[PDB]
From a paper:
Both helices are lined with highly conserved basic side chains that form an extended patch of positive surface charges. Due to the 3-helix architecture, helices α2 and α3 can move significantly closer to the tRNA than in the prokaryotic complex, allowing direct contacts with the T-stem and V-loop.
Consistent with its absence from primate mt tRNAAla sequences, the human mt AlaRS/tRNAAla system was recently shown to be insensitive to a G3:U70 identity element. Fine-tuned induced-fit adaptation selects mt tRNAAla and rejects non-cognate mt tRNAs.
Residue numbers in the entry: 811 to 988
Amino acid sequence: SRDVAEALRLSKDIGRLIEAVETAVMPQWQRRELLATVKMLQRRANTAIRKLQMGQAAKKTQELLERHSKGPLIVDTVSAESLSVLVKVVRQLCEQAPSTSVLLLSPQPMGKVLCACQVAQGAMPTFTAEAWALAVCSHMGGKAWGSRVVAQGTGSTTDLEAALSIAQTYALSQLLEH
């Protein structure tokens, strides 16, 4: 968590350095030389950040797998620092569980909650992820956006159990048809 934040901060500081070099007073050839080195640093930093996130997403999906069976549906709570990380967890879980539909909520301080969901390919085209996240998040007073296969949303509540119960009812209503 903190390690990821520091990594992110490092990148931001670097980004700040590129702008300082771009707007700096110096000969242009010199500017070009320093900018090339700085951009490369930025790339390394960005990759490091990506590696850290991907890894912590991997930790989570695995913990989740212990918690659940590779069933038709996974509805659960995970701690996620960012929406991007949570979305990654959903994608990995769905890579590892090809026949499962997934919706996850991550509690945030200030009573803010994020949602990401994905629908398995095997599942019927009628079942859509956007409406799934919209029912869950709209119950939490937020909003949702996405496509038929995947969607994301945000809401604000401390009653997570109610939202999870709606998430499962909505899914099972679509999954158990015929």
